[PDB]
Design an enzyme around this catalytic site. Sequence first.
Site, short mmCIF file in Angstrom:
data_model
loop_
_atom_site.label_atom_id
_atom_site.label_comp_id
_atom_site.label_asym_id
_atom_site.label_seq_id
_atom_site.Cartn_x
_atom_site.Cartn_y
_atom_site.Cartn_z
N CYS A 24 7.15 -1.86 9.76
CA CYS A 24 6.66 -3.00 10.51
C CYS A 24 7.78 -4.02 10.72
O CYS A 24 8.80 -4.03 10.01
CB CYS A 24 5.49 -3.65 9.79
SG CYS A 24 4.05 -2.59 9.72
N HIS A 55 7.69 0.28 4.45
CA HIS A 55 7.21 -1.02 4.89
C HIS A 55 8.39 -1.87 5.36
O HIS A 55 9.54 -1.62 5.00
CB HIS A 55 6.45 -1.73 3.77
CG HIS A 55 5.09 -1.17 3.52
ND1 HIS A 55 4.10 -1.15 4.48
CD2 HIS A 55 4.55 -0.59 2.41
CE1 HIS A 55 3.01 -0.60 3.98
NE2 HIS A 55 3.25 -0.25 2.73
N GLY A 56 8.08 -2.88 6.18
CA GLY A 56 9.14 -3.76 6.64
C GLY A 56 8.61 -5.08 7.15
O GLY A 56 7.40 -5.29 7.29
N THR A 114 0.82 -1.21 0.00
CA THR A 114 0.00 0.00 0.00
C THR A 114 0.86 1.26 0.00
O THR A 114 1.99 1.27 0.49
CB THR A 114 -0.91 0.00 1.23
OG1 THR A 114 -0.10 0.07 2.42
CG2 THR A 114 -1.74 -1.28 1.27
N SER A 115 0.30 2.35 -0.54
CA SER A 115 0.98 3.63 -0.45
C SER A 115 0.87 4.17 0.97
O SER A 115 -0.16 4.00 1.64
CB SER A 115 0.38 4.63 -1.45
OG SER A 115 -0.93 4.98 -1.08
#
Lengths: 91, 92, 5, 5, 140, 139
Positions: free
Chosen positions: E130, E88-89, E29-30
Amino acid sequence: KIPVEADFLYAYSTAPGYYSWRNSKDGSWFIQSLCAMLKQYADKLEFMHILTRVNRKVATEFESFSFDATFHAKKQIPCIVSMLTKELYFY
Amino acid sequence: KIPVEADFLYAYSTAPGYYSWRNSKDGSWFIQSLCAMLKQYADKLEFMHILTRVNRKVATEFESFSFDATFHAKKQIPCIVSMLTKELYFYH
Amino acid sequence: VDFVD
Amino acid sequence: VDFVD
Amino acid sequence: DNSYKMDYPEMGLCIIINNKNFHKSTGMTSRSGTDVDAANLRETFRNLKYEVRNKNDLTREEIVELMRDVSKEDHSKRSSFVCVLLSHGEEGIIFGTNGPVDLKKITNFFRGDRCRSLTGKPKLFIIQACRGTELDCGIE
Amino acid sequence: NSYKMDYPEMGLCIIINNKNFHKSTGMTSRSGTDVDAANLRETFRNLKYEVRNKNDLTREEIVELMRDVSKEDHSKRSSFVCVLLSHGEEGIIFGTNGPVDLKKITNFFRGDRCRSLTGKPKLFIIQACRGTELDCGIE
């Protein structure tokens, strides 16, 4: 000699294994809190104590709001990982 | 509410992925240093600052001595992992 | 509202 | 001597 | 010495990597709100006298090349180094726009033996990402 | 802001001292760990913790001990300390007979699972390997 892994600090937004939360208007809970605490305290507190205030702010002042019940009313604690060998004062 | 993972501190003897070192006569480098710094500073310093002194003691005052060259002259840094939300003092 | 990273 | 854990 | 020497001529660099938009191939997601974070960080570390560099929407190849290049600069006159990752992660992982990169690959460039002009100086990595898919329901 | 440390008791300090491992595990005896355990006992005695030393626990005994301790009433205690002295690898400490996930031990003390420690510092001190990498240092 010193260890090659010495003098690193990893200020993680969330605990190992967990999601991390971001508000579409205000930004991530962690970065919001980190910037607020650095603004208020970087001229007075050691960096680990600033990050402990960040932990408290994220932990107590935020709770998720989601139309998806699965993701609603959730909490977050950041995770300070210090291999530092000295205290850090920004002034 | 508070997070269920809040108010934990994990004081690891070594960095993720690494061996940790123990002296057969004096004990582990980390516990030697932790006990020394608590004895000297528990009445003076906040706990993360005590653990930072432990990091420096382990990092600067110890180096492995081994008859095996592959394990000789090695170093160690401990790893403080804090999900604490407040300062911790052992004194009144 | 809030989203996860 | 030193040993690893 | 109990405190890091912070009176070099320069506080140091603050590298901000702000990944908002990801390739459709990643399914990610953006990250609405991250521009607010990036601007907040820029101003906060400006006021701390860091040389801030903002980078947007980097692929994982570009992240590694940027970190490699930065670690090869002469930091002799700098007190410290700061890197902020907004993406993100997963556990141990940060996402470029096109896929994952190990955090260890990024931080290894700054090891005490690999970035000699930062040896003995604090290297700060600030990671908004994350680390898995667990949710903390809290306790009243 | 600071944790309240003036409850009637500082709290428990649980020390798990694993020195001798079953031969079938292949792990070495941890010469020097008895020195650590006695150092820790005296250090935390001087800090007014109620110290409990445990030696050579199996993985089952580690989990049972932690479960039992987390079910005590800690209402009058300021904090909780657990010291683990053993072999380990990333995320893992060893009982005398095999591995236990560190997360399984610490989950007993989660804020929702040990209510008499909610809001109080829970300290885990871990002397154990976290893998097999060696730090060669830099001069």
